[PDB]
Amino acid sequence: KTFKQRRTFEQRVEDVRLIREQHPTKIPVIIERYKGEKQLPVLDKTKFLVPDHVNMSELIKIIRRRLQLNANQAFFLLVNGHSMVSVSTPISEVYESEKDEDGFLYMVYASQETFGMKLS
Amino acid sequence: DSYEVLDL
């Protein structure tokens, strides 16, 4: 069961409304392991607040170490199901362009080899 | 249920 499945559409909209009042300079981001991804570990939490000045390069780095990944274990962040955002892009811009209808910004993480394997 | 702040 994903985050969207355990909580209705109305609950998530309200949830976004409230947390944005509390943190006007943070982006609410839902970060989950991609369903086909078995090699990379799971995170302990699903819901994150990222400071809105952060770029994608910095967010990947934060997720890397929070995942305790080794030198050469690559992972890709797919945003809003369909997008691979250039690393320099600020997340505030990614929020405004890629946020879900419910007001969350959704991401899944997977190795390139996992995304490759699934496309093939 | 709580959020986690991801700072650098």
Residue numbers in the entry:
A (entry chain B): 5 to 124
B (entry chain D): 16 to 23
Quote the paper.
We chose a FUNDC1 LIR peptide10–25 with pS17, which simulates the possible physiological state upon the induction of mitophagy and exhibits a strong binding affinity for LC3B, to co-crystallize with full-length LC3B1–125. The crystal structure of the LC3B-FUNDC1 complex was subsequently refined to a resolution of 2.25 Å in space group P 21. In the final model, the LC3B-FUNDC1 complex includes two molecules in an asymmetric unit both with observable electronic densities for 120 amino acid residues of LC3B5–124 and a main part of the FUNDC1 pS17 peptide16–23 (D-pS17-YEVLDL). The LC3B in complex with FUNDC1 exhibits four-stranded anti-parallel β sheets (β1–β4) separated by five α-helices (α1–α5) which is highly similar to the structure of apo LC3B (with r.m.s. deviations for Cα atoms of 0.695 Å). The side chains of FUNDC1 Tyr18 and Leu21 insert into two deep hydrophobic pockets of LC3B, resulting in specific recognitions between LC3B and FUNDC1. The pocket accommodating the side chain of Tyr18 is mainly composed of several hydrophobic residues including Ile23, Lys51 and Leu53 of LC3B, and forms a hydrogen bond between the carbonyl oxygen of LC3B Asp19 and the hydroxyl group of FUNDC1 Tyr18. Structural analysis shows that the enhancement of binding affinity induced by FUNDC1 pS17 is due to an additional hydrogen bond formed between LC3B Lys49 and the phosphate group of FUNDC1 pS17. However, in the complex structure, a largely shift (8.2 Å) of the Lys49 side chain is induced by its interaction with the pS17 of FUNDC1, providing enough space to accommodate the FUNDC1 LIR, especially the side chain of Glu19. Nevertheless, Glu19 in the FUNDC1 LIR forms a distinct interaction with LC3B Arg70 from its corresponding residue in p62, Thr340. In our complex structure, the N-terminus of the FUNDC1 pS17 peptide10–15, including Ser13, was not visible in the electron density map.
